[PDB]
Write a protein that binds this ligand. Structure first.
Ligand SMILES: [Mg+2]
Ligand SMILES: [Mg+2]
Lengths: 122, 156, 1202
RNA sequence: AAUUUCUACUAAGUGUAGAUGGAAA
């Protein structure tokens, strides 16, 4: 079939995601997962993606009024911008570290489908 | 005269917080030293009101008593007798040499009812009082410099 | 007799009041006619100018005589130091030679053309005249002594004590140790010597002296000693211009040319020390800020040097670039590693692989020693950070790209702020009302300041091994310039946060340098100041020096117009006034005295030291007694009634007796019409002591200071508040003008702002201007008193509170703990553990006449922090919030004081140094230290104003239950009635039994989670209660050497918070996960089934539910409604504690919510300290430890309830 | 929104309730 359509659609989705992953961290940036991609991928008949997680609801973006359990935050408050930055810094790095673990799963899917059928996607 | 006021006090406050670990000798001599240092910082703050008769104020044997108890070396003061710093016995003395000066000009004799010779002895006793108290104060700064450059702490 | 009947009259004090002073009658126009303000306005302003003139002459003196000294021991110091040393007390001879050299330049100064008339009186008189400055230095012709705060320090400039600001220490131990260093480093510039560059121009246009090797050979140190020689030396280093466009080269540039072969590795010649900010107007501060941070400023060039330094950083070794241990070390480690605790963890493992045994469990004492050994180290090497780092982590790239990110961030904020350093810049609004300009300046200053704080840790306090001196030599040479930004930060910040008004004042002297020192009758014609009462409008009297006896010849008037008048007889300092008078050449010629008495005082056996003899000093006591009887002033004016001669075991006792008695103020009358006619003649000046309580409308309680000052002239004033001397007077200026005050008009309904007033709007009949007090001028007056001058119940308070608390049998305890919900939460605990009274301190009751109108501060705080949010978080909002917190911790102290009196207690208080607490109370940490200060200040002298003055607890017999504050560490572990207690494990603790979680259940791997889930005892499920009962011992877990029970039967029910903000069921969530994974979970233990699965997400969504079974604190963080503390372990009655179960009672027996629980645990720790106070002798009470450990505390809080 | 001074006030109408230790670099 014409699985190239689904693959190029996925590839451009990758090229938006990896383009500005950082504005996904903002509360209300112009943006808008895995079950939808697997739904649009099962319909054409590919193998699925084998993601790292499906639940997605713990990537911290701007609930800066809506959490506490971080030992690292306690360590930051252990010794007297300033602190604010440590809390903002740690959640930003945790968000980026979550999203690239997402992104590597799509690149792994494309490498598997690349070196099985001899096409080119990266 | 507010920014530098807070700055010079929080610098020194950070040093008094910081030097509570450097000693690492027998005991908590930092308490006696900071108590002495704040005593210095009152003394040198208003030495001048010690000259007044009844200012809000109130030596060396007491400091050596509170210093021997913790086990420091003592201070090696300049004097212990203390009873000749002139403050407001302006009715209770005469022997000074500068009557030769005051008689070189007109002035008057040794009777202080004249309003001109009054300040002309008040100046000299004020300067002698300040000159006594800074000779006191230098002894405390010498003690702190000796204890500073023997054990590597910071006090001035 | 309760626990406060002891603690009064324990030690001295010295408050000082501050009332206003309005002149009465024609006194103000009399002052303006006799022109007594212009003189002291000059005597304030001209002082820095005359200081400038005397500093000019002093520096001319130094540069004068330094052209006449050639040091002789200099060769013998230089060669003997640069000799390779190998001392064996030869460095001691070096230091002897150094102090002798300082003595040589000291002797040069001593004989330097007099110099004895350099700090005496005639320096303002004689030498300094020989322009229009003759009146300037002649403005102080009858007034010399105000220079004595200058003549001491400028004398100490000429000492030899190796002090900092002095000449001698500089020119011998900084200049010479730079000079001989450059002398040795001259050996490493001889390979680049091109005479066309180093000799053909420098020697011809600088000195025409002997050549460049003379400055490195050591026999023009005596020529370079002057500042002209330092000028020539720094010209040969840097390069003179000689007012021509050549920009002639220097030795720094000639050594900079050597790294053309990309290898410098030769240190340059360090420049020599020579020998000796805004805050007014908007155009000036903008220009100086432009001067200090434009695109060619010195600080900005320092950033450019630093960024190129860290660009070419890789050439230096990684063995010397020491990173500073401490606060910033964790932040620096976190950026490269990606984890804050990675550096601490690697050092932890590196230490425990040596000192830990072949087991793995720890003790808390070994942990505290571990933390002490980690804080033992001074700094870390970059090589050790590469050692910590695993593969693909090169710090020489990682830190370089971080710092270039920061420098490019400063360049981007320059790209933001580039409209500010332009020549055609405009100020459209003043900085008080403008926002964009000042926030731009704020972003610039904070960005460069953050850059400095990031760079800061590359010092290592060194003091090191072979550190990279070729790197540090330019690093500090840029960092000294980067540290100058604090002079701009603490200029701009305190410029913008200052008030529109201004509190500058000058001391008023009234033509006399000897002014109001005392209040002694028979010295009042000298001091020239007295105080008159009449009804209650008090008065201050100033007599002019032309007519300095206008109060002596006054009759006791009988036409009933009178001012009562003080007399104020004070014997000053009787331990060292009596030998000053009774041996002073006129008393020795009026009394005889006896020969043995003169000898016994001259040898001085009345003092201590074992020469102390009772029946020998008793004759001296009798001599003092009889002579004071014979003295005319002191036989009459006091009522001296001593003990007998055998009733003084110490002359210190007799001195205390005469110091106790020798003070009496009475009132002999005077006229009124003759006094007011006299002040109409102008021979008197008369001011009324006044504040907002001497008015005739004050229908309430006064200020406490006016209560003291009205109590200074009572017949109750024996017990004892002595009006001292040292009084001053001051004068302000009209900071504001009258017109531009925003004035509320009369007869209009004016607004309100406290929302809990039933009178939601009011109106007045007259005006109420904004800040009327700075419209005119006002005479501030100060009148310093000395409360409890003679102390009686004298003892060590820190031991007396303990020996009181042991013998006590039901000692109350207050606790005070910060909380997220409430900034301060009070809990009062009995001697058992029952919570007597628990309440918040967000609402402030003002219990005046009958009308308990409350006011909130919590709403005020959040309503001002929203303005902080919407106003880009600028300095005015910050300092407004800091002052609002300061007012709040003022008004707490009345509640704490009254609570201490009402319950007879000892305050507990959260220690700070131990910390280890989130402390999310929405208040700054510093504000708590200020609360410490403004609590121990007030509990130095506790008094409540509504009480009667004579009765105990009043303004005469106040409570003293603390010591004075000493220093920010010496406030620890006891202070009188304030105890300091570490705040560890005080908020997250079940109050019923004492279960605390200690389980690190942040998910790491199934490799850890399988063992962690097998370590539990019995995970089952009860169907007749629908609970997921867990079970465990604690001894099979790491970090667990503190609990005592270790048999914790957990459960599940009660509401919990899940991010999803959302609400989830603890036991329904467990059931839905176990029905997601298809279990017959009703035959526990089910760990055998749970150790079979192999997908990650099951265990990742199980760890996040274990943690929610353990999370006791619940904050919805958007509303104050549900902040509920729930504990998943139940007590003997089978019910586990819920906060909302205990909120809806009147007086609970357990804490209401989280902050109250945080208070109640602190109270419990002090109760344990009291329990150990009850279990020692009175000979170890000064040594009984209070620092209760985590193990001890958890043991007590579990076995208290049973 | 008035103050010896500071904070929160308008508190019965030129103030209320608490606090406040000043000069000096
Ligand atoms: Mg009042
Ligand atoms: Mg106000």
């Amino acid at each position: 079939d014409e699985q190239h359509d689904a693959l190029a659609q996925l590839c451009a989705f990758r090229h938006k995601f990896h383009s500005n992953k950082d504005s996904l961290f903002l509360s209300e940036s112009a943006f808008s997962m895995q079950s939808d991609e697997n739904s649009k991928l099962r319909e054409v008949g590919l193998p699925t993606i084998e993601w790292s997680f499906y639940d997605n609801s713990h990537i911290p973006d701007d609930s800066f009024r809506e959490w506490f359990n971080f030992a690292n935050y306690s360590e930051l408050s252990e010794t007297i911008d300033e602190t604010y930055e440590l809390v903002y810094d740690e959640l930003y790095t945790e968000a980026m570290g979550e999203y690239e673990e997402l992104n590597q799963d799509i690149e792994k899917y494309l490498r598997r489908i690349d070196e099985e059928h001899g096409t080119q996607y990266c | 005269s507010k920014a530098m006021y807070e700055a010079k006090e929080r610098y020194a406050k950070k040093k008094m917080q910081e030097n509570t670990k450097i000693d690492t000798l027998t005991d908590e001599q930092h308490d006696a030293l900071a108590q002495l240092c704040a005593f210095r910082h009152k003394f040198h703050s208003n030495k001048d009101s010690l000259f007044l008769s009844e200012s809000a104020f109130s030596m060396q044997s007491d400091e050596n008593s509170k210093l021997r108890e913790v086990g420091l070396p003592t201070i090696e003061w300049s004097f212990y007798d203390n009873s000749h710093i002139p403050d407001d016995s302006f009715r209770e003395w005469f022997n000074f040499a500068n009557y030769s000066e005051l008689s070189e000009t007109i002035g008057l004799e040794l009777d202080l009812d004249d309003d001109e010779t009054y300040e002309l002895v008040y100046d000299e006793l004020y300067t002698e009082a300040m000159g006594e108290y800074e000779e006191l104060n230098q002894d405390i700064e010498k003690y702190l410099r000796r204890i500073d450059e023997e054990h590597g702490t910071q006090y001035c | 007799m309760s626990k406060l009947e002891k603690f009064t009259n324990c030690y001295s004090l010295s408050k000082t009041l501050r009332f206003k002073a309005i002149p009465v009658g024609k006194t103000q126009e009399n002052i303006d006619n006799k022109r007594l303000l212009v003189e002291d306005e000059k005597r304030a302003e001209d002082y820095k100018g005359v200081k400038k003139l005397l500093d000019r002459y002093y520096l001319s003196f130094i540069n004068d005589v330094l052209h006449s000294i050639k040091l002789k021991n200099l060769n013998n110091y230089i060669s003997l130091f640069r000799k390779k040393t190998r001392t064996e007390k030869e460095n001691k001879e070096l230091e002897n030679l150094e102090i002798n050299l300082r003595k040589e330049i000291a002797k040069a100064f001593k004989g330097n053309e007099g110099y004895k008339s350099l700090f005496k009186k005639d320096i303002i008189e004689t030498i300094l005249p020989e322009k229009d400055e003759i009146a300037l230095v002649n403005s102080f012709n009858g007034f010399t002594t105000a220079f004595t705060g200058f003549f001491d320090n400028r004398e100490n400039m000429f000492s030899e004590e190796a002090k900092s600001t002095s000449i001698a220490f500089r020119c011998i131990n900084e200049n010479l140790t730079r000079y001989i260093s450059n002398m040795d480093i001259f050996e490493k510039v001889d390979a680049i010597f091109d005479k066309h560059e180093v000799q053909e121009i420098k020697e011809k246009i600088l000195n025409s002296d002997y050549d460049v090797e003379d400055f490195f050979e050591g026999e023009f140190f005596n020529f370079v000693l002057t500042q002209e020689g330092i000028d020539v030396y720094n010209a040969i280093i840097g390069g003179f211009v000689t007012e021509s466009g050549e920009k002639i080269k220097g030795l720094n540039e000639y050594i900079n040319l050597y790294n053309q072969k990309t290898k410098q590795k030769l240190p340059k010649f360090k420049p020599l020390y020579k020998q000796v900010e805004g805050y007014t107007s908007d155009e000036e501060v903008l220009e100086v800020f432009r001067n200090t941070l434009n695109k060619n400023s010195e600080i900005f060039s320092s950033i450019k040097k630093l960024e190129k330094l860290f660009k070419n950083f890789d050439e230096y070794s990684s063995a010397g670039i020491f990173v500073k241990n401490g606060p910033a070390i964790s932040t620096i480690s976190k950026d490269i590693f990606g984890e804050w605790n990675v550096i601490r963890d690697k050092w932890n493992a590196e230490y425990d692989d040596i000192h830990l045994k072949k087991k793995a469990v720890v003790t808390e004492k070994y942990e505290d020693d571990r933390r002490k050994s980690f804080k033992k180290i001074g700094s870390f090497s970059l090589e050790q950070l590469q050692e910590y780092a695993d593969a693909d982590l090169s710090v020489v790239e990682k830190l370089k790209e971080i710092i270039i990110q920061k420098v490019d961030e400063i360049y981007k904020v320059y790209g933001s702020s580039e409209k500010l350093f332009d020549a055609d810049f405009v100020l459209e609004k003043s900085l008080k009302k403008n926002d964009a300009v000042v926030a731009i300046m704020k972003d610039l200053l904070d960005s460069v300041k953050s850059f400095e704080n990031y760079i800061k840790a590359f010092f290592g306090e060194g003091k090191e091994t072979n550190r990279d001196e070729s790197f540090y030599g330019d690093f500090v040479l840029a960092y000294d310039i980067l540290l100058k930004v604090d002079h701009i930060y603490d200029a701009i910040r305190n410029y913008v946060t200052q008030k529109p008004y201004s509190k500058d004042k000058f001391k008023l002297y009234f033509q006399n340098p000897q002014f109001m020192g005392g209040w002694d009758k028979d010295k009042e014609t000298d001091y020239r100041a007295t105080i008159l009462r009449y009804g209650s409008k008090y008065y201050l009297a100033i007599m002019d020096k032309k007519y300095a006896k206008c109060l002596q010849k006054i009759d006791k008037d009988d036409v009933n117009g009178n001012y009562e008048k003080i007399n104020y007889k004070l014997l000053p300092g009787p331990n060292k006034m009596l030998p000053k008078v009774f041996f002073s050449k006129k008393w020795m010629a009026y009394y005889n005295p006896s020969e043995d008495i003169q000898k016994i005082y001259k040898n001085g056996t009345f003092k201590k030291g074992d020469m102390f003899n009772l029946n020998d000093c008793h004759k001296l006591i009798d001599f003092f007694k009889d002579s004071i009887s014979r003295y005319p002033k002191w036989s009459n004016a006091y009522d001296f009634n001593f003990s007998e001669t055998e009733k003084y075991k110490d002359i210190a006792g007799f001195y205390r007796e005469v110091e106790e008695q020798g003070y009496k103020v009475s009132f002999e009358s005077a006229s009124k019409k003759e006094v007011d006619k006299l002040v109409e003649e102008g021979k008197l000046y008369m001011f009324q002591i006044y504040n907002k309580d001497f008015s005739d409308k004050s229908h309430g309680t006064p200020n406490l200071h006016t209560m003291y000052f009205k109590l200074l002239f009572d017949e109750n004033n024996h017990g004892q508040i002595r009006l001292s001397g040292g009084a001053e007077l001051f004068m302000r200026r009209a900071s504001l003008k009258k017109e531009e005050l925003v004035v509320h008009p009369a007869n209009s309904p004016i607004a309100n702002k406290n929302p809990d007033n039933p009178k939601k709007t009011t109106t007045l009949s007259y005006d109420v201007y904004k800040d009327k007090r700075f419209s005119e001028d006002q005479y501030e007056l100060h009148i310093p008193i000395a409360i409890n001058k003679c102390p009686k119940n004298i003892f060590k308070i820190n031991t007396e509170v303990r020996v009181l608390l042991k013998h006590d049998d039901n000692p109350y305890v207050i606790g005070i703990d910060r909380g997220e919900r409430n900034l301060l939460y009070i809990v009062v605990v009995d001697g058992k553990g029952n919570i007597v009274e628990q309440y918040s301190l967000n609402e402030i009751i003002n219990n005046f006449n009958g009308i308990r109108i409350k006011t909130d501060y919590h709403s005020l705080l959040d309503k001002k922090e929203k303005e902080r949010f919407e106003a880009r978080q600028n300095w005015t909002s910050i300092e407004n919030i800091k002052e609002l917190k300061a007012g709040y911790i003022s008004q707490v102290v009345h509640k704490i004081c009254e609570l201490v009196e009402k319950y007879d207690a000892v305050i507990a208080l959260e220690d700070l140094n131990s910390g280890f607490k989130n402390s999310r109370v929405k208040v700054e940490k510093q504000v708590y230290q200020k609360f410490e200060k403004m609590l121990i200040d007030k509990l130095n002298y506790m008094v409540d104003k509504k009480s009667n003055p004579c009765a105990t607890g009043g303004a005469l017999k106040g409570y003293q239950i603390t010591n004075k504050f000493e220093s920010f560490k010496s406030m620890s572990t006891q202070n009188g009635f304030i105890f300091y207690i570490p705040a560890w494990l005080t908020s997250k603790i079940d109050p019923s039994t004492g279960f605390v979680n200690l389980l690190k259940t942040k998910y790491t791997s199934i490799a850890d989670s399988k063992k962690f889930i097998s370590s539990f005892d019995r995970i089952m499920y009860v169907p007749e209660e629908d609970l997921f009962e867990f079970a465990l011992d604690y001894k099979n877990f790491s970090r667990t050497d503190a609990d005592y029970i270790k048999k914790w039967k957990l459960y599940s029910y009660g509401n919990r918070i899940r991010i999803f903000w959302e609400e989830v069921c603890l036991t329904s969530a467990y059931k839905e996960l176990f029905n997601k994974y298809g279990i017959n979970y009703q035959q526990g233990d089910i760990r055998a089934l749970l150790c079979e699965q192999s997908d990650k997400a099951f265990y990742s969504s199980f760890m996040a539910l274990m943690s929610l079974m353990l999370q006791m604190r619940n904050s919805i963080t958007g509303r104050t409604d549900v902040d509920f503390l729930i504990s998943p372990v139940k007590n003997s009655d089978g019910i586990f504690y819920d906060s909302r179960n205990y909120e809806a009672q009147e007086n609970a027996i357990l804490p209401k919510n989280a902050d109250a629980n945080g208070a109640y645990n602190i109270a419990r720790k002090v109760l344990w300290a009291i329990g150990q106070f009850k279990k020692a002798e009175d000979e170890k009470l000064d040594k009984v430890k209070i620092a209760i450990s985590n193990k001890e505390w958890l043991e007590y809080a579990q076995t208290s309830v049973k």
